[PDB]
Amino acid sequence: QPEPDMITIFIGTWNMGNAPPPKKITSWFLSKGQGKTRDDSADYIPHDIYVIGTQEDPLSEKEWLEILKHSLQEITSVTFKTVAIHTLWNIRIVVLAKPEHENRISHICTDNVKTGIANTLGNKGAVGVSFMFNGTSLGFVNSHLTSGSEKKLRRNQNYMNILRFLALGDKKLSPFNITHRFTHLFWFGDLNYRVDLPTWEAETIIQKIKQQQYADLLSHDQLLTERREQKVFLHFEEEEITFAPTYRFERLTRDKYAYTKQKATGMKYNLPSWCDRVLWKSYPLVHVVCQSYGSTSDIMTSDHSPVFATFEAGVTSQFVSKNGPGTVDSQGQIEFLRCYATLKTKSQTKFYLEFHSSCLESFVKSQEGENEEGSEGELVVKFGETLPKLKPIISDPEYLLDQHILISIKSSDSDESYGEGCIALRLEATETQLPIYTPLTHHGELTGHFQGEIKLQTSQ
Ligand SMILES: c1csc(CNCc2ccncc2)c1
């Protein structure tokens, strides 16, 4: 039975509005409703992995698991296995997988982050799950960020606290946050970003939604504008939105947006908004294709509609050779030549690199680089041809060309990372000097760049 080189992943996010679900929620898992929807001819084909994020979830874990499993069994006639379930207050993530994948899934991690301080601590935050699927690491984050149209900056802060403090994936990747620990990272939830138009325009916005004319609304969506200004979700992708705003509906219909201020809303307006989102970040040159992104039309117990997204995702097998794992394969080598880091720091410490990869027995520390001043005010750290030759555990090009090298640039004085990035080994050529590049981030914000040349030797 051959190992897969692709899987499909379902991501759902639903803010349930503290109400039990209706008796049938199959449309959610079938990617049916509005937006980029799934073809009817696929309805019986199970996804490999289903990841369900809820917010304002009133059910116990047991009650929700029974509903989810019975929903999937009705659609697919497959009894899914529970990989993980994790709940923080009323924020929950469930991961289900086809039974044939049970032996392929390992290193299962869960965590949560509580956002805010005092007043703002007690209901918002994130849950996450990570695991290995054969040779591929997968991470999933369900966040419920701060509400309210005038709190985009707090949402951005919530995002940075979650990616800093959520402890998922390989704890040996110590300089790296969740935005670098996984082959594929999916981040979804009630992100709570709003359409930033005047209150007086509410009925105009409703009109536009009835005409399915979303362009002048999306141009005011805070998540798209904050992303375009590099204030949040740097280096994440989102499929184009082609479904109506998913919030705020009158319950038991989808015919009415309930936007006006009420005591129950703290006297806040809730103009129709795309609160409910799915974003992703995959390592460079790994296959990831969004095959659906939309909202259901027929699940009306909440003031939000459920959102679905589905993906093709490249995966790799758990490779064994006669040499690695448990030794190096002397027929393989990675050389980083004429590399330099450009840093936005005003610090004048010396810097060294760490190279981390599951193709190495352990991470590799470089010598210190040579600091120079850049012409427009920056620090350039030059490494020359000084960098240690990396010795991969396996030299087979079928394995090595699918790997990635994480790079951290650390201060000699403090050992703290000033920037993290990732280089694909999916090169155009072996035994050939080729340009490489990654942006460097720290706490998910841009701190610099790393560029130079690579020369990869495989067994072929
Ligand atoms: C439910 C869905 S995944 C899972 C974990 N499976 C661990 C494993 C067991 C044997 N061999 C390889 C991996 C439980």
UniProtKB/Swiss-Prot annotation:
Compartments (UniProt record): Cytoplasm; Cell membrane; Membrane raft; Cytoplasm, Cytoskeleton
Role, per record: Phosphatidylinositol (PtdIns) phosphatase that specifically hydrolyzes the 5-phosphate of phosphatidylinositol-3,4,5-trisphosphate (PtdIns(3,4,5)P3) to produce PtdIns(3,4)P2, thereby negatively regulating the PI3K (phosphoinositide 3-kinase) pathways. Able also to hydrolyzes the 5-phosphate of phosphatidylinositol-4,5-bisphosphate (PtdIns(4,5)P3) and inositol 1,3,4,5-tetrakisphosphate. Acts as a negative regulator of B-cell antigen receptor signaling.
Post-translational modification summary for this protein: Tyrosine phosphorylated by the members of the SRC family after exposure to a diverse array of extracellular stimuli such as cytokines, growth factors, antibodies, chemokines, integrin ligands and hypertonic and oxidative stress. Phosphorylated upon IgG receptor FCGR2B-binding.
Lineage: Eukaryota, Metazoa, Chordata, Craniata, Vertebrata
Family: Belongs to the inositol 1,4,5-trisphosphate 5-phosphatase family.
Protein name: Phosphatidylinositol 3,4,5-trisphosphate 5-phosphatase 1
Coiled-coil parts of chain: none
Effect annotated for changing residue 288 to E: In one patient with acute myeloid leukemya; somatic mutation
Subunit structure, as described in the record: Interacts with tyrosine phosphorylated form of SHC1. Interacts with tyrosine phosphorylated form of DOK1. Interacts with tyrosine phosphorylated form of DOK3. Interacts with tyrosine phosphorylated form of SLAMF1/CD150. Interacts with PTPN11 in response to IL-3. Interacts with receptor EPOR. Interacts with receptors MS4A2/FCER1B and FCER1G. Interacts with receptors FCGR2B and FCGR3. Interacts with receptor FCGR2A, leading to regulate gene expression during the phagocytic process. Interacts with GRB2. Interacts with PLCG1. Interacts with tyrosine kinases SRC and TEC. Interacts with c-Met/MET.
Record remark on domains: The SH2 domain interacts with tyrosine phosphorylated forms of proteins such as SHC1 or PTPN11/SHP-2. It competes with that of GRB2 for binding to phosphorylated SHC1 to inhibit the Ras pathway. It is also required for tyrosine phosphorylation. The NPXY sequence motif found in many tyrosine-phosphorylated proteins is required for the specific binding of the PID domain.
Gene: INPP5D
Shown stretch of the complete protein: 398 to 857 of 1189
Tissues showing expression: Specifically expressed in immune and hematopoietic cells. Expressed in bone marrow and blood cells. Levels vary considerably within this compartment. Present in at least 74% of immature CD34+ cells, whereas within the more mature population of CD33+ cells, it is present in only 10% of cells. Present in the majority of T-cells, while it is present in a minority of B-cells (at protein level).
